[PDB]
């Protein structure tokens, strides 16, 4: 009928077992696994899905536990990948306790080390894998932003790879680029989509906001270098930016605001955000009030005056700027000296100087 | 019997069917999909209460035999 | 421009000004292309009638540039195209080319205005202004004005 | 989304299967108890 | 609306597959300007039930479920059917919106199939047809713009564009203006 | 303006009028700044050629103001820049400055129109008009 077959159509018993596995008929699947002796657990749905994949896809944890105890059960790696994608934490825990992951080092070894051996571990059918072959469990969990699954995989030693520089000349990057050059760039985008997620950013590193700023600039440059995938790198950089913004958004007292803005008061992180153009971070009310308190250092009352009073003091500075400079040279440290060193008064002095300059330009054309 | 183009098209179209079903799972639930689960609960309730009644009547006949 | 962003009233205005200037630079480039086209065309057309025209509008390169540029703001009269002789064909072609130039100018101007309006509708003014004003502030945090800072 | 609700539907289905099998266990045990009587 | 047509309308992939297993197929309505006895009698009888039936059959044919499960090469079928519905929209203007929506369905089906490629072999199979970019030519001819403008097709065309200019692929625009002037 | 808000036809119009005036006041301030800039510049440029020009456009402050302001509506001719002498450099700089002034005027006008259109798209006309008309009504309730 259909001019494509993705799965002779098994057996009546196999169809009944697949129905029981998909729809969570625990007693029937237990009975069959115990005493069938003609059925094979690797019988396949019409979509190419064995009993384990069907049970995991419908969140049947008890059926999953029953199937995992059956020796020579197939499609376990893809079962883990699917459970991670759907965020089924308990099914992920049950699959990870299987000898396939407990004895082996599947989660620790890199995607390339998994790919060098054929081993068809994360393959779900005769030919291919459900997600991209480079997408490891940790990368997939980071993609889906499953915080608990990311934490679990990090506990087991899984880490995202930090792809090499774009203009890289090492043998591995050279062979990857000569081989396909499209699977390579897509794999790079996948690894960066894993790195740029808030779950992995928060759970993986010591200083997630510094990592997020640096990675945001990294992806912003990647977007310019690789223009065909410009949108993807742009979205990932935006993810990093608003992660930093959301971390800043949670501060509740001045100590936390200082820790976020001053880095470890030189506003190092504010400088970095302006340099990398994380505009929502700098324009956020917390950073704004910090910068504002620094702006009116010694001008306690002036912070609240109407704009007319500040125009008044602008004019007064324009008038007394000769006397103010004379007094700065004469009495360098005083009330006058402390007021003269405040940043807002420095700015009004600059503005008044420029206005005097324009007034000289005009008055020179008098008569 | 199948050529590499046919195999690749088979792979891609199976991937498309699975991805399209996943994207269908990403649609907002509507009122009918919830009424279906309500009817699930209702039929389950009926079946379970009838099972309990079966147990009670069997215990009654067992008393009668005593 | 160094002083306006500090004002909450005038900051967002100046930010939008920088934005629209950065945008319309591209349409200015395209208009330069089409304007140069029409300039060279009409110059080659009229260059031979140095002393046979009403005025000297399209006789030389620079004067053709002046006339066609001032035609953008409607400050150029239409008598510049008329000839003194009875070469009706040349002056008719001049009428046609000048009118087509004005129409194409209007077309380009409308498209620019509207590509701009579209860029606007898909968009943060507060965030942009505050980013600029924060840069302005941070410029003054590091420990006298330039005129008085000559004294060491 | 639709999948988060299909998950709860499968929850209900598996729960139904388990409960009905428990009731059947009770009935068959009462049957063997009658047989012993 | 037969069971198979209804299943295609609702895009029930498993139901469409089940019905296809049983031998059900959508009918492929005849040409618009058709003169055979069946089309003649249908058009003389009602002529509104006829056009609505044609739209129903095309709504069944143009669905991604039936497209994917029914034919050997769903992307070629989808391109041809997209052009078919685009012409139908012009011919039958009262139902212009319906045919336009169905043609868009076909277009974005092709785009979604292209969107899934993960290595160069699959991209070649999608773009080169069975390297003459036959499917790219067809998409430009039928104006499937999202298919051609998709990053995968774009990077393929770009690798063909800079054939032997290995370093020049990454140069700034100033260097390319320089080489333009040097060629001049 | 005291009478129009009572009309359901003309009320919302007048409300939008007050709104757009309040908005464009700011761009008027900015245009005052740039216009004063160009005025003082061209005045300092041309002031020495009182009796060496076609007309007296940019000879004095007030006349420079008049010429440059009337240039906004295209009511000023371009012969005002030309000199009688052979100081080609000064008249070329005059051409350049006047053209740049007109271009900057167009730029500012476009930006104002569009900052305004954006303020509009993110927005209650009924509510605003009814608030104003209710104020108008309440002004007459006291005996
Ligand atoms: C009317 C004529 C005679 C003088 C016009 C001068 C203006 C063209 C310039 C010169 C001084 C400038 C002002 C100098 C100081 C300030 C305060 C500055 O900051 C504030 O709005 C108060 C709150 C704060 O400073 O954080 C905003 C810009 C403003 C008004 C400047 C705006 C532009 C001004 C008015
Ligand atoms: C045509 C020439 C000769 C006279 C033009 C007069 C208008 C400029 C002014 C003067 C009288 C005004 C009108 C006097 C009374 C009213 C009724 C007033 O209220 C209504 O719309 C009716 C419902 C209500 O009053 O609640 C609305 C404004 C209106 C038309 C005024 C609108 C502006 C008018 C027409
Ligand atoms: Ca469950
Ligand atoms: Zn490398
Ligand atoms: Zn026919």
Q: Judge whether A77 and A121 are in contact, CB under 8 Å.
A: yes
* Cα–Cα distances in angstroms (integers) from residue E2 to residues E7, E14, E99, in the given order: 9, 16, 20
Cβ–Cβ < 8 Å for A222, A233: yes
Q: Is the CB of A133 less than 8 angstroms away from the CB of E118?
A: yes
User: Encoding tokens for residue A121?
Assistant: 């571990």
Q: Which helix (H) or strand (E) holds F38?
A: helix F11-46
Contact A288, C134 (CB under 8 A): yes
* Integer Cα distance of E87 and E91 in angstroms: 6
Q: Decide: E26 and E60 in contact? Cβ < 8 Å.
A: yes
Distance CA A47, CA A130 (A): 12
Specify the residue with its C-alpha closest to ligand 1, atom 4: A355
For residues E50 and E43, the answer to whether their CB atoms sit within 8 Å is yes
Nearest to B63 by CA among D29, D33, D26, D24: D33
Of all residues in chain A, what percent are helix, strand and coil, respectively (each to 5)?
65, 0, 35
- A55/A79 Cα distance (integer angstroms): 9
Nearest CA in chain A to C146: A350
- The number of beta carbons lying within 10 Å of the beta carbon of residue B10 is 18
Ligand positioned closest to the Cα atom of A169 = 4
Q: What is the DSSP letter of F81?
A: G
Query: How much of chain B is in helix, strand and coil states, percent to nearest 5?
Result: 85, 0, 15
Burial class (CB in 10 A: 0-12, 13-18, 19+), E136: buried
Contact A155, A104 (CB under 8 A): no
Q: Hunting for tokens 């008329």 — which residue is that?
A: C82
Residues F44/F64, Cβ–Cβ less than 8 Å: no
Alpha carbon B53 to chain centroid, angstroms: 26
Residue A304 assigned as binding residue: no
A interface test, pick of D17, D22, D28 with most A CB neighbours within 10 Å: D17
Using H for helix, E for strand and C for coil, what is the string for chain C? CCCHHHCCCCHHHHHHHHHHHHHHHHHHHHHHHHHHHHHHHHHHHHCCCCCCECCCCCCCHHHHHHHHHHCCCCCCCHHHHCECCCCHHHHHHHHHHHHHHHHHHHHHHHHHHHHHHHHHHCCCHHHHHHHHHHHHHHCCCCCCCCCCCCCC
What is the 8-class DSSP label of residue A73? -
Q: Which residues line ligand 1 (CB under 6 A)?
A: A 307, 310, 314, 351, 355; C 3, 6-7; F 33
What residues contact E98, with CB distance under 8 A and at least 6 apart? Answer: E55, E59
Instruction: Report how far residue A311's alpha carbon sits from residue C116's, in angstroms, rounded to the nearest whole number.
Output: 35
Contact between A271 and A281 under an 8 Å Cβ cutoff? The reply is: no
Give the Cα separation of A197 and E10 in Å (integer). Answer: 35
Mutate to test the pocket of ligand 2, among F7, F14, F134 (most ligand atoms within 8 A of CB): F7
Size of interface A-D (CB pairs under 8 A): 29
Q: Which atom of ligand 1 is nearest to the CA of A354?
A: 10
One-letter-per-residue 3-state SS of chain D:
CHHHHHHHHHHHHHHHHHHHHHHHHHHHHHHHHHHHC
In 10 A of CB A102, how many CB atoms?
10
Nearest CB to A58; choose among D10, D17, D21: D10
- Among the listed residues C44, C55, C41, the one whose alpha carbon sits nearest the alpha carbon of residue C83: C55
3-class secondary structure, F83:
strand
Helix (H, G, I), strand (E, B) or coil at A279: helix
Tokens of E127: 């773009």
- Report d(CA C139, CA F37) in Å as an integer: 26
- Closest residue on chain A to D9 (Cα): A58
What token pair was written down for B54?
């079966």
> By C-alpha distance, which of A322, A318, A326 is closest to A352?
A318
Q: Give contacts of A165 with chain E, Cβ < 8 Å.
A: none
* Chain D: closest CA distance from residue A146 (Å): 15
Q: How many CB atoms lie within 10 A of CB A35?
A: 8
Copy the structure tokens of residue F50. Answer: 């009182």
Contact (CB, 8 A) for E119 and A187: no
Residue found under tokens 């440029």? F45
Q: Please, what sign has the CA dihedral across residues F48, F50, F52, F57?
A: positive
Residue A103, judged by CB atoms within 10 A of its CB (0-12, 13-18, 19+), counts as exposed
CA distance F98 to F96: 6
Q: Scanning the structure block, which residue is given the tokens 């008009």?
A: F129
State CA A136 to chain mean position distance. 16
The answer to whether the CB atoms of D30 and B65 lie below 8 A apart is no
Total H helices, total E strands in chain B = 2, 0
Which residue matches tokens 């049970």? A55
Q: How far apart are CA F26 and CA C10, in angstroms?
A: 7
- Helix and strand totals (H; E) in chain E: 12, 0
| Interface contact A351-C131, CB threshold 8 A | no
**For residue E171, how many other CB atoms are within 10 A of its CB?**
13
Which residues sit opposite C53 in a β-bridge? C83
Cβ-based neighbour number of residue A329 at 10 Å: 11
Of ligand 1's atoms, which has the minimum distance to the CA of residue C9?
Answer: 21
Compute CA distances A333 → A46, A280, C143, whole Å. Answer: 86, 39, 15
Q: CB-based contacts of E85: which residues, under 8 Å, 6+ apart?
A: E58, E62, E99, E100, E102, E103, E106
Separation of CA A19 and ligand 1 centre (Å): 77
Q: Which of F1, F2, F3 to mutate to test the pocket of ligand 2 (most atoms within 8 A of CB)?
A: F3
Report d(CA C14, CA C8) in Å as an integer. 11
Strand partners, F53: F83
CB A134 within 8 A of CB A115: yes
CA of A182 to the centre of ligand 4 (A): 16
Residue nearest to atom 2 of ligand 1 (CA): A355
Q: Which of B23, B50, B58 to mutate to test the interface with D (most CBs of D within 10 A)?
A: B58
Asked if C10 lies within 8 A of F29 by C-beta distance, the reply is yes
Q: Which residue has the tokens 């808000």?
A: F5
Please give the method by which this entry was determined.
cryo-EM
Using the mean position of ligand 2's atoms as its centre, give its distance from the Cα of residue F6 in Å. Answer: 8
Which residues partner with A44 through β-bridges?
A50
Task: Give phi and psi for A71, each to the nearest 5.
Answer: -60, 160
- Per the CB < 8 A criterion, the answer to whether C127 and A274 are in contact is no
**Probe target for ligand 1 pocket from C1, C2, C3, C141, with the most ligand atoms within 8 Å of CB:** C3
| CB atoms closer than 10 angstroms to residue A59 | 22
B17 and E122 within 8 Å at the Cβ level: the answer is no
Q: Is the CB of F127 under 6 A from ligand 2?
A: no
E173 close to E144: Cβ distance less than 8 angstroms: no
Phi-psi region of C121 (alpha: psi -120 to 50; beta: other; left: phi over 0): alpha
Place of tokens 């995202």: A160
Q: Spell out the residues 6+ positions from residue F66 whose beta carbon is closer than 8 angstroms to its own.
A: F57
For residues C35 and C29, the answer to whether their CB atoms sit within 8 Å is no
Inter-residue long-range contacts of B4-8, CB under 8 Å, 24+ positions, other chains counted: B4/E121, B5/E125, B5/E130, B6/E72, B7/A127, B8/E121, B8/E122, B8/E125
Contact predicate E70/E25, CB 8 Å: yes
Q: Going by CA atoms, what residue is nearest to atom 28 of ligand 2?
A: F7
Could F47 and A362 be called an inter-chain contact, meaning their C-beta atoms sit closer than 8 Å? no
Resolution of the coordinates in A?
A: 3.9
Instruction: State the Cα–Cα distance between residues A213 and A279, nearest whole angstrom.
Output: 12
What's E18-63 look like in SS3? HHHHCCCCCCCCCCCCCCCHHHHHHHHHCCCHHHHHHHHHHHHHCC
**Structure tokens belonging to residue E12:** 């029930």
Answer yes or no: are the C-beta atoms of C94 and C42 closer than 8 Å.
yes
Residue B23, marked binder: no
Structure tokens at A96: 């990870």
Structure tokens at C95: 């009428």
CB-side neighbour CA atoms (13 Å) of A210: 9
Q: What is the DSSP string of A315-345?
A: HHHHHHHHHHHHHHHH-SSSHHHHHHTSHHH
Residue by residue, DSSP assigns A119-185 as TTSSB-SSS-BSS-TT--HHHHHHHHT-HHHHHHHHHTT-----PPPSS--SHHHHHHHHHTSSHHH
What is the three-class DSSP state of A50? strand
- Give me E3's structure tokens: 């069971």
Between CA A262 and CA A291 the distance in angstroms is 11
Q: Which of E72, E118, E151 sits opposite A228 (nearest CB)?
A: E151
**Which residue puts its alpha carbon closest to atom 11 of ligand 2?**
F3
Q: Which two tokens stand for residue C76?
A: 């150029």
For residue F86, give the H/E element and its range: none
Cα distances (angstroms) measured from residue A363 to each of A359, A367, C148, E141, F90? 6, 9, 20, 70, 22
* Buried-exposed string B50-60: b where 16+ CB fall within 10 A, e elsewhere: ebeeeeeebee
> Which residue is listed with tokens 């699930």?
B40
* Alpha-carbon radius of gyration of chain B: 25
Give the position of tokens 């004019």.
A315
Find out whether the beta carbon of F6 lies less than 6 Å from any atom of ligand 2: yes
Phi, psi of A208 (to 5 degrees): -65, -25
Torsion angle of C-alpha atoms A345, A350, A356, A362, degrees rounded to 10: -140
Contact partners for chain C, using 3 or more CB pairs closer than 8 A, are A, F
Q: What angle do CA C116, C121, C126 make, to 5 degrees?
A: 100
CA separation for the pair A226, E172 (Å, rounded): 12
- Give the closest of B48, B52, B65 to D37, CB-based: B65
DSSP E151-169: HHHHHHHHHHHSSS-TGGG
Nearest-neighbour CA in chain B from A7: distance (Å): 10
| Chain D residue with minimum CA distance to B36 | D9
CA atoms within 13 A on the CB side of B34: 6
Residue F58 exposed, middle or buried by CB count within 10 Å (0-12, 13-18, 19+): buried
Residue B12 tokens read as: 């891609």
Query: From its phi and psi, is residue A72 left (phi > 0), alpha (psi between -120 and 50) or beta?
Result: left
Q: For residue A350, count other CB atoms closer than 10 A to its CB.
A: 19
Q: Report how far apart, in Å, the C-alpha atoms of A181 and of each of A193, A268, F41 are.
A: 18, 38, 59
Contact indicator for A66, A30 with CB cutoff of 8 Å: yes
Please tell me the distance from the alpha carbon of residue F98 to that of residue C72, in angstroms, as a whole number: 13
In a 13 Å sphere around the CA of D30, the CA atoms on its Cβ side amount to 17
Query: A181–E120: do the CB atoms touch at under 8 Å?
Result: yes
Which of E150, E26, E3 lies closest to E77 in space, CA to CA? E26
Q: Are C27 and C111 in contact (CB under 8 A)?
A: yes
- The sign of the torsion formed by the CA atoms of E49, E55, E61, E66 equals negative
Radius of gyration (Cα) for chain C, nearest Å? 24
Cα separation, E107 vs A131, whole angstroms: 25
- Among C25, C37, C27, which residue's Cα sits nearest to residue C101? C37
Token output for E55: 């739209």
The pair of structure tokens assigned to E107 is: 């277009």
Distance of alpha carbon E22 from alpha carbon D29, whole angstroms? 45
Question: Can you read off the two tokens belonging to residue E86?
Answer: 């685009």
- Where do the H-state alpha helices sit in chain F? 11-46, 61-70, 88-121, 125-138
């Amino acid at each position: 009928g259909p001019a494509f077959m993705f799965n002779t159509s098994l057996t009546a018993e196999e169809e009944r077992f697949l129905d029981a596995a998909e729809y969570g008929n625990i007693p029937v699947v237990r009975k069959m696994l115990e005493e069938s002796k003609t059925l094979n657990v690797n019988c396949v749905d019409y979509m190419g899905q064995n009993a384990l994949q069907l049970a995991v896809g419908n969140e049947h944890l008890e059926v999953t536990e029953l199937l995992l105890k059956k020796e020579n059960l197939a499609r376990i790696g893809d079962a883990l990948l699917l459970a991670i994608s759907k965020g089924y934490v308990r099914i992920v825990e049950a699959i990870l306790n299987h000898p396939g992951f407990a004895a082996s080092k599947r989660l620790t070894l890199s995607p390339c080390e998994q790919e060098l051996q054929d081993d068809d571990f994360y393959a779900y059918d005769e030919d291919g894998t459900r997600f991209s072959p480079d997408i490891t469990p940790i990368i997939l969990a980071a993609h889906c932003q499953k915080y608990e699954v990311v934490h679990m995989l990090l506990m087991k030693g899984a880490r995202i790879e930090r792809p090499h520089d774009y203009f890289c000349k090492c043998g591995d990057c050279m062979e990857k680029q000569r081989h396909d050059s499209f699977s390579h760039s897509r794999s790079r985008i996948n690894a960066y989509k894993g790195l740029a997620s808030p779950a992995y950013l928060s759970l993986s590193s010591e200083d997630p906001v510094l990592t997020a700023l640096e990675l945001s600039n990294e992806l912003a440059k990647l977007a310019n270098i690789e223009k065909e995938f410009k949108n993807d790198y742009r979205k990932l950089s935006m993810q990093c930016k608003d992660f930093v913004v959301g971390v800043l958004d949670l501060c509740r007292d001045s100590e936390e605001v200082e820790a976020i803005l001053n880095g470890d008061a030189s506003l190092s992180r504010v400088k970095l955000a302006i340099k990398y153009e994380v505009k929502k971070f700098v324009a956020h009310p917390n950073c704004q009030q910090q910068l504002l308190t620094i702006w009116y250092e010694n001008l306690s009352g002036l912070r609240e005056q109407t704009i007319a009073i500040k125009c008044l003091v602008v004019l007064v500075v324009a008038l007394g700027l000769p006397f103010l400079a004379i007094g700065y040279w004469i009495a360098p440290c005083s009330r006058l000296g402390k007021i003269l060193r405040s940043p807002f008064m420095k700015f009004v002095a600059h503005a008044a100087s420029f206005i005097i300059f324009l007034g000289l330009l005009v008055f020179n054309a008098s008569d | 019997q199948p050529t590499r183009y046919q195999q690749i098209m088979k792979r891609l179209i199976k991937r498309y069917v699975l991805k399209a079903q996943v994207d269908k799972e990403n649609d907002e639930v509507n009122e009918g999909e919830l009424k279906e689960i309500k009817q699930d609960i209702s039929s389950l309730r009926y079946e379970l209460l009838e099972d309990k009644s079966q147990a009670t009547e069997e215990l009654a006949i067992l008393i009668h035999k005593l | 421009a160094y002083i306006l962003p500090a004002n909450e009233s005038f900051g967002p205005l100046q930010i939008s000004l920088g934005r629209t200037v950065k945008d319309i630079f591209k349409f200015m480039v395209l208009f330069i292309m089409v304007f140069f086209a029409f300039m060279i065309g009409m110059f080659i057309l009229y260059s031979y009638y140095l002393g046979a025209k009403v005025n000297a509008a399209f006789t030389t390169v620079e004067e053709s540039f002046k006339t066609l540029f001032w035609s953008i703001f409607g400050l150029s009269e239409v008598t510049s195209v008329v000839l003194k002789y009875d070469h009706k064909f040349i002056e008719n072609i001049g009428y046609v080319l000048y009118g087509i130039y004005n129409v194409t100018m209007v077309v380009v101007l409308l498209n620019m205005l509207i590509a701009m309006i579209n860029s606007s509708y898909q968009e943060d003014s507060d965030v942009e202004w505050k980013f600029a004003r924060s840069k302005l502030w941070l410029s003054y945090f590091d420990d006298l004005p330039p005129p008085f800072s000559l004294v060491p």
